[PDB]
Design a protein around this ligand. Sequence first.
Ligand SMILES: CN1CCOc2cccc(NC(=O)Nc3cnc4[nH]ncc4c3)c21
Length: 165
Amino acid sequence: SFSGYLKLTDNVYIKNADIVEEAKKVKPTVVVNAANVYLKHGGGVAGALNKATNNAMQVESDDYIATNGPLKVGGSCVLSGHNLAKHCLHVVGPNVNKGEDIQLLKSAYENFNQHEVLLAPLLSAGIFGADPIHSLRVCVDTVRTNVYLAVFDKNLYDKLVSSFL
Ligand SMILES: CN1CCOc2cccc(NC(=O)Nc3cnc4[nH]ncc4c3)c21
């Protein structure tokens, strides 16, 4: 199961880890992708997860969009986890660098409540432009199911733990 995580709350855990390496080791039921509405997995966590699947995540995602159209900011869809997990929950947090409303971050984290346990990144963090400290606060105050947060950057991980209320 998940190992080496620091316990933040009754249901939220955190670790300084590369989510691709973590997913390959644990093979969780659900890995969360930091998706955009088009499921174009070019960079950030999405680019990394898609590269680990040898682009199979992108081929599946393009068929999903061709059939269903784009997701909503704050929405999600469940697709295959390929070689990383049973399922991938593609969640769209607001991208501050595209001028999207940070208030949609709580709606994005509500998608996690449909799954009993998840391996996830902090939504809207990294190249999505939000404050990761804020994202962790919204995560703890919204998600009720068991969430294992992987934070790639060691310096950010230390800042998140040391400033956690
Ligand atoms: C190095 N690993 C181990 C297993 O083999 C593969 C295969 C594909 C990708 C990676 N990891 C990766 O790209 N990680 C990555 C990058 N940028 C990122 N930005 N934000 C998160 C985040 C994660 C790995």
